[PDB]
Structures are given as C-alpha cells and as structure tokens.
Design a protein around this motif. Structure first.
Motif, PDB file in Angstrom:
ATOM      1  N   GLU A  12       0.820  -1.211   0.000  1.00  0.00           N
ATOM      2  CA  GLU A  12       0.000   0.000   0.000  1.00  0.00           C
ATOM      3  C   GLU A  12       0.858   1.266   0.000  1.00  0.00           C
ATOM      4  O   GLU A  12       0.608   2.201  -0.775  1.00  0.00           O
ATOM      5  N   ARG A  13       1.861   1.318   0.884  1.00  0.00           N
ATOM      6  CA  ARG A  13       2.713   2.501   0.995  1.00  0.00           C
ATOM      7  C   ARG A  13       3.457   2.773  -0.310  1.00  0.00           C
ATOM      8  O   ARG A  13       3.506   3.915  -0.786  1.00  0.00           O
ATOM      9  N   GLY A  17      -1.566   4.752  -2.588  1.00  0.00           N
ATOM     10  CA  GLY A  17      -3.010   4.819  -2.463  1.00  0.00           C
ATOM     11  C   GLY A  17      -3.595   4.117  -1.246  1.00  0.00           C
ATOM     12  O   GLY A  17      -2.932   4.004  -0.201  1.00  0.00           O
ATOM     13  N   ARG A  18      -4.847   3.660  -1.371  1.00  0.00           N
ATOM     14  CA  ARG A  18      -5.575   2.985  -0.302  1.00  0.00           C
ATOM     15  C   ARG A  18      -6.044   1.633  -0.824  1.00  0.00           C
ATOM     16  O   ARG A  18      -6.747   1.572  -1.838  1.00  0.00           O
ATOM     17  N   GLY A  20      -7.717  -2.280  -0.150  1.00  0.00           N
ATOM     18  CA  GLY A  20      -8.629  -3.117   0.622  1.00  0.00           C
ATOM     19  C   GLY A  20      -8.615  -4.560   0.143  1.00  0.00           C
ATOM     20  O   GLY A  20      -8.762  -4.810  -1.061  1.00  0.00           O
ATOM     21  N   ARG A  35      -7.994  -3.475   5.714  1.00  0.00           N
ATOM     22  CA  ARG A  35      -9.007  -2.429   5.522  1.00  0.00           C
ATOM     23  C   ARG A  35     -10.343  -3.018   5.053  1.00  0.00           C
ATOM     24  O   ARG A  35     -11.088  -2.414   4.284  1.00  0.00           O
ATOM     25  N   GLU A  38     -13.575  -0.935   5.531  1.00  0.00           N
ATOM     26  CA  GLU A  38     -13.665   0.390   4.920  1.00  0.00           C
ATOM     27  C   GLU A  38     -14.449   0.302   3.616  1.00  0.00           C
ATOM     28  O   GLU A  38     -14.518  -0.764   2.988  1.00  0.00           O
ATOM     29  N   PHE A  40     -15.194   1.310  -0.332  1.00  0.00           N
ATOM     30  CA  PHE A  40     -14.529   1.573  -1.595  1.00  0.00           C
ATOM     31  C   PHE A  40     -15.593   1.624  -2.686  1.00  0.00           C
ATOM     32  O   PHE A  40     -16.549   0.839  -2.671  1.00  0.00           O
ATOM     33  N   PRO A 148     -13.213  10.403  -3.258  1.00  0.00           N
ATOM     34  CA  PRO A 148     -12.906  10.055  -1.859  1.00  0.00           C
ATOM     35  C   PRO A 148     -13.894  10.714  -0.903  1.00  0.00           C
ATOM     36  O   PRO A 148     -14.269  11.872  -1.076  1.00  0.00           O
ATOM     37  N   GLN A 239      -6.813   5.910  -5.355  1.00  0.00           N
ATOM     38  CA  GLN A 239      -5.668   6.806  -5.261  1.00  0.00           C
ATOM     39  C   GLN A 239      -6.075   8.236  -4.975  1.00  0.00           C
ATOM     40  O   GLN A 239      -7.252   8.590  -5.070  1.00  0.00           O
TER      41      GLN A 239
END
Ligand SMILES: [Cl-]
Length: 261
Positions: A12-13, A17-18, A20, A35, A38, A40, A148, A239
């Motif tokens: 992820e890093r 982005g994010r 799941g 995640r 969460e 999406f 987002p 992203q």
C-alpha cells in the motif's frame, strides 16, 4: 500471519493509495483482511450483483433470459464494446448479462439495472441475501466517479467477499443459475492483468474487474487452486489524484502476497 499484514502495508505505501483486501479460504474457513471494513467505490464490480438479481428473477420466470431488449443510440454511454455492435437491433437478457460480466459493457449493466427496477432494487436484492453493506446508488456512467469520502456506489471488502462466496459457492441462486454465473465469470476477458496475474498459471479463475475516477482499480474473484479447496478474493484500490492512472499490478501483487504458500 503478521507477515502477510506487513507485506500488504508495504505494498500500500509503495503504491501511494488505499488498498482493501479480503480473502476467504474455504479449506479452513479462515480470512485474511486488510481495511476490509472500509468502503470503496465498486465501479464495474457491481455488475455481479446486477446479473445475479436477473438470475434470481429468472427462477420464477422461465424464458426471462431469452427476453429481447432494444439497443438504441440513446442507450450508449462511455464504454460500450458489445452494445455498439447491436444498435437498432435487440439483445437478450442472457447476452446482456454475458456482455456486462465478460466485457464490462456499461449499456449492458444499465439494461440489467433497469430490468429489475433500478439501483434501489439491486440494493434490495443484496439486503435479501444478508448483505447490509452493499449500496448501488446510480447507473452508468456516473456510478464510477469514485470521489474520496463519497459513500455512493460502495461496499467493503469483507462484505463483497462474503456475498461473492454465497453467489458462486453457496446457495443464493438455484443450481442452474449459480452454474450460469460461474460460467460467465470464468469467461471474463478483462481480468488477466489483475488478480489472475498474481496466481500460478494452472489455477482457474472467475473474476469481475472495475475501474473509475481517482485511479480506482478493482477485481473480485472465485479461485480454484490446483488440488485445493476454493478461495474467494476481493482486491480494491483507489488513489489520491482525480486523474491517477490505473494500477492493475497492485491487485496482482496483493493476490500473490495473500496466496503465497
Ligand atoms: Cl490529477
């Protein structure tokens, strides 16, 4: 393991982005989650629920799948790979389901939505199955905006994995209808660079991709590994920049991390 968690965090890093992820392993009834509660934006991956709603309706209406639907210039949206070949003729609901699931045809999706009563009817079908997270708010093309913070047209990885398990390996659909959904998903043409790209060549995959604004890049899959019990895998990715480019490689990397061993 904590190692799988550290590897997903590193991925992820590096991606910016994010991410799941939800994997269900039916060998031991275990999950790997990242995640997974969460929300999406689903984009194209929502076509599975629309096609499943039509299949469910067909259980009490034989020859529903053979019903003809007119395709007009006014039906065209932003991505119409199959429907653009059929303007001024008709396609059956079976042909529209296959086009939605195997080519991500957005006219086909809109016809499945309309047939069952609209986005709120697809959402009500999800609720009937026991999925209280999925929400389909809009039609194509606007359901792909993926802004987002916007909850429209979203679900969580955990919920989508559990629902896809019910649809493909469970008893949400009758035997004929379940087999048809699995056959359609195994014939997808859009997923070879996503989950499939992180798995051995010998494994069998049925999947549905999605993409949208903010570089959103998604895939959901049922997987038959060689000589093993089936898996269900959801990989969702989005992203920070509105015009970010697609990142199917991130989904492949996530699939490799969670299935290694
Ligand atoms: Cl941008």
């Amino acid at each position: 393991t904590a190692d799988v968690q550290q590897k997903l965090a590193e991925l992820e890093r590096q991606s910016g982005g994010r991410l799941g992820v939800a994997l269900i392993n039916t060998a031991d009834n275990s999950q790997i989650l990242y995640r997974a509660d969460e929300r999406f934006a689903m984009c194209x991956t929502s076509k599975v629920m629309a096609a499943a709603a039509v299949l469910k309706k067909s259980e009490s209406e034989p020859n529903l799948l053979n019903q003809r639907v007119e395709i007009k210039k006014s039906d065209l949206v932003n991505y119409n790979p199959i429907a653009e070949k059929h303007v001024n003729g008709t396609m059956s609901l079976a042909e529209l389901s296959a086009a939605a699931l195997q080519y991500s045809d957005n006219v086909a999706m809109n016809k499945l939505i309309a047939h069952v009563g609209g986005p709120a009817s697809v959402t009500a079908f999800a609720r009937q199955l026991g999925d209280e997270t999925f929400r389909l708010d809009r039609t194509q093309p606007t359901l792909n905006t993926a802004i987002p913070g916007d909850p429209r047209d979203t679900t969580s990885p955990r919920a989508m994995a559990q629902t896809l398990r019910n649809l493909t390996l469970g008893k949400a659909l009758g035997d004929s209808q379940r087999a048809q959904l699995v056959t359609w998903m195994k014939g997808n043409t859009t997923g070879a660079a996503s989950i499939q790209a992180g798995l051995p060549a010998s494994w069998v995959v049925g999947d549905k991709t999605g993409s949208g604004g903010y570089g959103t890049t998604n895939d959901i899959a049922v997987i038959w590994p060689k000589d093993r019990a089936p898996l269900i895998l959801v990989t969702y990715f989005t992203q920070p920049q509105p015009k970010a480019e697609s990142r199917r490689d991130v989904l492949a990397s996530a699939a490799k991390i969670v299935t290694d061993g």
